[PDB]
Design an enzyme around this catalytic site. Structure first.
Site, PDB file in Angstrom:
ATOM      1  N   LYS A   1      72.625   7.375 -40.438  1.00 13.63           N
ATOM      2  CA  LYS A   1      71.848   6.186 -40.773  1.00 13.63           C
ATOM      3  C   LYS A   1      72.259   4.953 -39.970  1.00 13.63           C
ATOM      4  CE  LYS A   1      69.397   5.554 -44.150  1.00 13.63           C
ATOM      5  NZ  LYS A   1      68.630   5.280 -45.396  1.00 13.63           N
TER       6      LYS A   1
ATOM      7  N   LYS B   1      66.184  38.044 -33.915  1.00 15.09           N
ATOM      8  CA  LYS B   1      67.427  38.480 -33.281  1.00 15.09           C
ATOM      9  C   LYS B   1      67.745  39.930 -33.623  1.00 15.09           C
ATOM     10  CE  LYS B   1      72.222  37.057 -32.505  1.00 15.09           C
ATOM     11  NZ  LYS B   1      73.394  36.276 -32.996  1.00 15.09           N
TER      12      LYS B   1
ATOM     13  N   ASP C   1      74.543  21.744 -34.382  1.00 11.67           N
ATOM     14  CA  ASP C   1      74.096  23.056 -34.826  1.00 11.67           C
ATOM     15  C   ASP C   1      75.053  23.621 -35.866  1.00 11.67           C
ATOM     16  OD1 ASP C   1      76.184  23.352 -33.102  1.00 11.67           O
ATOM     17  OD2 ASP C   1      75.396  25.140 -32.102  1.00 11.67           O
ATOM     18  N   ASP C   2      74.486  24.368 -36.816  1.00  8.46           N
ATOM     19  CA  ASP C   2      75.242  25.014 -37.887  1.00  8.46           C
ATOM     20  C   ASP C   2      76.058  23.981 -38.671  1.00  8.46           C
ATOM     21  OD1 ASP C   2      74.377  27.614 -37.951  1.00  8.46           O
ATOM     22  OD2 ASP C   2      76.032  28.436 -36.773  1.00  8.46           O
TER      23      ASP C   2
ATOM     24  N   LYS D   1      67.118  29.703 -34.808  1.00 10.56           N
ATOM     25  CA  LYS D   1      67.026  28.272 -35.061  1.00 10.56           C
ATOM     26  C   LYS D   1      67.858  27.445 -34.088  1.00 10.56           C
ATOM     27  CE  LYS D   1      68.977  28.919 -39.035  1.00 10.56           C
ATOM     28  NZ  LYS D   1      69.223  30.016 -40.009  1.00 10.56           N
TER      29      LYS D   1
END
Ligand code: ATP
Ligand code: ATP
Ligand code: ADP
Ligand code: ADP
Ligand code: MG
Ligand code: MG
EC number: 3.6.4.6
Lengths: 402, 529, 316
Positions: free
Chosen positions: C207, C284, C179-180, C125
């Protein structure tokens, strides 16, 4: 046999066959003198020489305890056995090196052992048998049991009519054996057929500790003298010739009251150097002017004589308090280290807390020697008592009862 | 075609050429063409790398090449002197000479190099952005103003040297300020050979060294050795060789009878390599000496299987190009003897770098100092072409006490980020960890960060117990047969560590009571599979 | 020619151009030094001094690093082994990413667009977010990751986040990547525990709309959709996409061929075994298994692979 067959590991039947170092087998399966490869896994193969005994049940190979330990074999386990043929043109052993030690710690002794006779006996016993590097076995010589470990094997030279290293080889009549004792072994080996590997040792000048006034610190004294003062005794011309320098730092840490101050003052009274100039650590904690006051004599002497002034020793006391304030540390480091430094100064630091000491102060170029002076053992106490009760032993003032 | 073999620097070939071309070629060409082309001169350089790699030598050599004033010196944590006010007066007392020379000689004076040191201390606010600490910054403003701004100079050059490159404020790495930034790393195989040749030329011209010395062997037997430590070695060897001939027993003094053929011999180079010098970025021989105490004994299949898997893992991380980082977790019931298998696996690799990070050296630390120590230990492992690291008790670093439960979340969040980070480039790392509780590490979602797992079981059959007893070799055939009878029944649940303690406790009694005592102790321990 | 050099320098601040000119002049002016004896000057080429396009290009490639510009080197540490088409989902995800990219560049009523990627662990991802961003050709492409902030405190993390998002309002276009997410909030199922401040900062930032006339795009990744749905963060993301795992025999027999490690004889047996079953394995893990099994002997590389696949693989 040639393709390989499954077989069951067993125990050696007799002590003689256990000493023979040969795998004991049944006559119905193989013949004496044959060599086999024993597989316990894809990555575990071991080469053995066979000997037949009537008591071996067909379907089982008997191994001695040293063989089982070397090959990681267990009684009753399943192994694969396949006939193995040596390439005698390449695998004959010309010279092999063996580590030897006493098999049983209860039978250790200081008697000499003739390595020529043990070499002859080894050839007589193990001729026409396979040996691999790292192999462990038991050897009987003069009714004494020894543990042997194979260290190195070299191939045989061609016959006169017509030195490669090998992992596994065949011992033959004309093979040569070089024996070496194990590390810290008390075995006394004599003769010429000896590997005789004691090269990694230091020859040291013969000091006279008893008169020197110190007892039980021989090794520390020898090491310090070798590493920190062996260069200021040779004439400076040789020092320039070789292109060396002079150490500038020593650190000695240990429990209180073990001989730290003496171990330096005594050497100070041995190079015919100037008397030390002790300073205290916690009291100086205007301090910069005090720190500068110490080396003024050294600076003046160096200026007067250049590279000919005698060594000046400083016995700077506990250093954990001062160095961990920062101004003193920087001043000292600049004085010892940097572009501007004296070449007739030696700093000796002492302390009790080794861990608390900074790390920057311990780097090559900086303080580059460390030692630990611990409590004395029985020998040290004996020598210390003898030195401290010598005055009364001369005047005839001590009783025989003590 | 700058030749650096003569100057003394060896191994640092490309870096020197790059640092010359990019920021120095404009101080050699005549002033007329420089003015015509309309070029100014760089006034800053930064160097970062591990200590003892030959940086201050490079600085002095480059300074002396152009025939300029000999360098000055300063110290970072020093200029932060007694207090403020003088903190900006010490800065002032460095550049007066340059300004005076500029005014007197106009724009024709000589270069006045200034070599800072530990520059990341005097100029630091990023350190405050870490657990704890905190300090104001004022001196950087004065230094920046002096470097550029009003009354700027055209005959100055500042060279900064640091050990940590990630705590330098960005304000000093902009064009006009320090521009060029270079890295000096540990020497490679050729570097050691060149350095040894450069450092042992004086004694090979006056015919002192012996003929039985081979430089290539000494080069290949030293792995991950810094620059200065080679000098330290070559010195200690000479010290021993000189010591051999000091025949004195009273009032020292040299002996001429033996002195004549003073010759350093290969032995004096080998004895030196075993006791005197100890590398810092290398093997640690006092860490695997007190862990595998009683050795390893093959009492069954599991030992062989575990060792084979360890070998496969250690060979995959060395001959692969798609998985630079691998990890493996060992688990089992307590007292099963797993902290010894990790050390044995690691020591068999023969990697240049092998460093344990046990929790036994941190007694009383707080949750921040743990994070700091772990980060430093891991950081030291990004400076070698091969690395192996070991973590012991992954449940005594977290402090998981069942009541509560309680633990330091910060340590967990650092640890679960370090185990998924690849090294900088082309470097191989292996991580092994040990643990006893495998039902509290699953709930924290830790098992999805480890690429595999292995199981170390207990002794669970009478045959294995008998084999272990025989291999240890304490009870003889009589007691073995006696102990081989009561133990019929496959309900022996016991760890290997406990067995040694039980045997030692049993041995202390009288000769004829030992078997009964051992059987009673084995029965009282229970099974609880 | 000045025009080409001007066009091929994007988001260059004022000073960097002077830096480029100086670097080019220095590089062109080093070829005429041939003094290896105390270095004074070289004749025979003191004339003919020039600055040719080659030095300009070399300096632009290796010697100048803009601050508000693309950072190519970074991507070398995320998209490691490339991208291999093993199934329909890869094409689907890439097409949707491309449409999203071409919505935040030819629109006038939607200056801001945000998307969320999610899926089971070890499904890749991140090396798809990196590949999607790299094909935008946007002037400003940053990557915020939790591994550059190890050991920080709450306030430090909030400052770092607010600062990275504050350098994306100064460029005509941008694409910022996170990420993560679950490793920034410091989430741990026991408790639970996390940092409320970071969550509030992240929501308010997500936002926000940039100043007039500028556009932005945010791509995020996560591995626990339900937990995020609990905190109501799923209402701040405009769209979401699903990244699946290899589940069928043929889609494994295709990946094993595209990777190109096992050969026909072994492939036939692998198919004979796998085809009559279902599988469940992330992409993976497959590489790690395949390079776990290649280290055995030539005549056993097919049995260890299957044995390993029977414990972790086919283990839903
Ligand atoms: N497989 C093995 N076979 C035989 N002896 C072993 C084996 N593994 C370890 N040993 C030996 O037995 C002891 C192993 O116990 P160890 O010191 O590893 O306890 P430990 O597992 O670290 O305890 P814990 O993990 O509960 O803290 C050591 O003395 C070691 O030499
Ligand atoms: N089409 C592909 N899709 C995904 N990964 C691929 C693809 N082709 C090759 N790969 C390789 O597989 C790796 C899988 O992604 P990566 O290693 O980043 O783990 P991940 O599952 O995304 O991470 P995490 O567990 O942190 O969510 C990619 O980095 C790349 O190395
Ligand atoms: N190994 C030893 N042999 C002989 N005398 C010793 C020894 N160790 C200590 N002593 C005696 O004990 C005293 C120790 O004093 P000192 O050297 O000042 O201790 P420290 O240096 O540890 O403070 C000395 O007077 C010395 O004569
Ligand atoms: N490449 C090299 N060639 C020769 N000597 C070196 C080299 N690198 C380091 N040294 C040695 O290191 C010493 C200087 O260390 P230095 O570079 O000042 O350490 P640091 O940079 O950590 O302060 C010198 O005595 C020099 O002989
Ligand atoms: Mg343990
Ligand atoms: Mg990820």
């Amino acid at each position: 046999n040639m393709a390989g067959r499954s077989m069951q590991a067993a125990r050696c039947p007799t002590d003689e066959l256990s000493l023979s170092n040969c795998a004991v087998v049944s006559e119905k399966d193989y013949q004496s003198g044959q060599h086999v490869i024993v597989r316990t896994s894809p990555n575990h193969k071991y080469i053995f020489t066979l000997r037949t005994h009537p008591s071996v049940v067909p379907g089982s190979v008997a191994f001695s305890l040293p063989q089982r330990k070397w090959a990681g074999l267990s009684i009753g386990q399943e192994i694969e056995v396949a006939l193995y043929s040596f390439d005698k043109a390449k695998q004959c052993i010309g010279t092999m090196t063996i580590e030897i030690d006493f098999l049983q710690k209860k039978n250790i002794d200081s008697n000499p052992y003739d390595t020529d006779k043990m070499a002859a006996e080894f050839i007589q016993q193990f001729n026409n048998q396979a040996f691999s590097v790292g192999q462990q076995l038991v050897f009987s010589f003069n009714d004494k049991l020894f543990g042997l470990l194979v260290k190195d094997i070299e191939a045989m030279d061609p016959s006169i009519l017509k030195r490669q290293k090998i992992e596994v080889g065949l011992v033959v009549g004309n093979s040569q054996v070089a024996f070496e004792k194990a590390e810290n072994s008390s075995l006394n080996l004599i003769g010429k057929a000896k590997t005789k590997e004691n090269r990694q040792s230091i020859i040291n000048p013969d000091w006279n500790f008893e008169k020197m006034g110190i007892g039980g610190l021989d090794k520390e004294f020898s090491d310090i003298f070798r590493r920190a003062f062996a260069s200021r005794v040779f004439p400076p011309e040789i020092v320039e010739q070789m292109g060396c320098k002079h150490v500038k730092g020593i650190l000695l840490y240990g429990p209180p009251g073990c001989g730290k101050t003496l171990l330096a003052r005594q050497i100070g009274k041995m190079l015919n150097a100037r008397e030390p100039k002790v300073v205290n650590g916690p009291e100086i904690l205007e301090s910069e002017a005090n720190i500068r006051k110490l080396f003024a004599d050294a600076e003046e002497e160096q200026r007067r004589l250049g590279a000919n002034s005698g060594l000046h020793i400083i016995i700077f006391d506990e250093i954990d308090a001062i160095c961990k304030h920062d101004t003193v540390v920087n001043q000292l480091l600049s004085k010892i280290d940097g572009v501007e430094q004296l070449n007739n100064i030696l700093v000796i630091g002492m302390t009790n807390r080794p861990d608390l000491i900074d790390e920057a102060l311990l780097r090559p170029g900086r303080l580059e020697v460390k030692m630990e002076i611990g409590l004395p053992d029985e020998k040290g106490r004996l020598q210390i008592l003898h030195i401290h009760t010598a005055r009364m032993r001369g005047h005839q003032l001590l009783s025989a009862d003590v | 075609d700058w030749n650096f073999e003569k100057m003394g620097i060896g191994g640092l070939d490309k870096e020197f050429s790059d640092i010359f071309r990019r920021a120095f070629a404009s101080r050699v060409f005549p002033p007329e063409i420089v003015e015509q082309m309309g070029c100014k001169h760089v006034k800053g350089i930064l160097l970062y790398g591990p200590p003892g790699c030959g940086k201050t030598l490079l600085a002095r050599q480059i300074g002396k090449m152009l025939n300029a004033r000999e360098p000055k010196v300063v110290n970072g944590p020093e200029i932060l002197n007694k207090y403020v006010g003088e903190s900006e007066a010490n800065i002032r007392k460095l550049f007066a000479d340059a300004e005076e020379e500029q005014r007197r000689l106009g724009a024709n004076s000589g270069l006045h190099i200034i070599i800072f040191d530990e520059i990341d201390a005097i100029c630091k606010q990023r350190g405050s952005m870490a657990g704890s600490t905190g300090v104001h910054d004022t001196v950087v403003n004065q230094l920046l103003s002096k470097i550029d701004g009003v009354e700027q100079l055209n005959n100055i050059l500042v060279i900064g040297m640091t050990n940590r490159p990630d705590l330098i404020d960005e304000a000093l790495l902009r064009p006009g300020r320090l521009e060029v930034k270079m890295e000096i790393g540990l020497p490679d195989e050729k570097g050691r050979l060149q350095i040894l040749h450069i450092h042992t030329a004086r004694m090979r011209g006056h015919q002192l060294l012996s003929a039985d010395v081979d430089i290539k062997e000494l080069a290949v037997e030293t792995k991950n050795f810094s620059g200065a430590e080679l000098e330290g070695l070559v010195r200690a060897a000479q010290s021993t060789a000189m010591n051999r001939h000091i025949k004195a027993s009273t009032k020292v003094e040299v002996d001429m009878e033996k002195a004549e053929s003073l010759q350093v011999t290969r032995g004096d180079f080998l004895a030196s390599l075993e006791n005197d010098i100890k590398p810092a970025f290398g093997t640690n021989q006092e860490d695997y000496a007190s862990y595998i105490m009683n050795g390893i004994i093959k009492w069954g299949d599991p030992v062989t299987r575990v060792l084979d898997d360890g070998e496969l893992l250690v060979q995959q991380t060395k001959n692969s190009d798609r998985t630079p980082l691998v990890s493996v977790l060992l688990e089992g019931p307590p007292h099963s003897g797993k902290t010894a298998l990790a050390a044995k696996i690691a020591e068999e690799s023969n990697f240049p770098f092998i460093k344990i990070c046990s929790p036994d050296k941190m007694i009383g630390f707080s949750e921040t100092a743990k994070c700091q120590a772990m980060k430093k230990i891991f950081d030291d492992a990004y400076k070698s072409q091969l690395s192996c690291v070991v973590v012991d008790d992954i449940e005594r670093l977290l402090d998981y006490v069942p009541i509560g439960p309680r633990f330091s979340n910060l340590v967990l969040q650092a640890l679960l980020v370090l185990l998924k980070k690849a090294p900088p480039q082309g470097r191989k790392l292996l991580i092994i960890g040990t643990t006893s509780r495998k039902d509290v590490l699953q709930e924290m979602e830790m098992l999805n960060a480890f690429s595999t797992t292995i199981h170390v079981p207990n002794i669970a059959t009478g045959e294995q117990l008998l084999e272990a007893l025989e291999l240890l070799g304490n009870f003889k055939d009589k007691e073995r047969t006696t102990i081989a009878q009561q133990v019929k029944g496959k309900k022996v649940w016991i760890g290997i560590k406990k067995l040694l303690m039980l045997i030692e406790m049993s041995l202390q009694m009288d000769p004829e009571y030992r078997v009964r005592k051992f059987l009673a102790l084995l029965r009282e321990e229970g099974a609880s599979p």
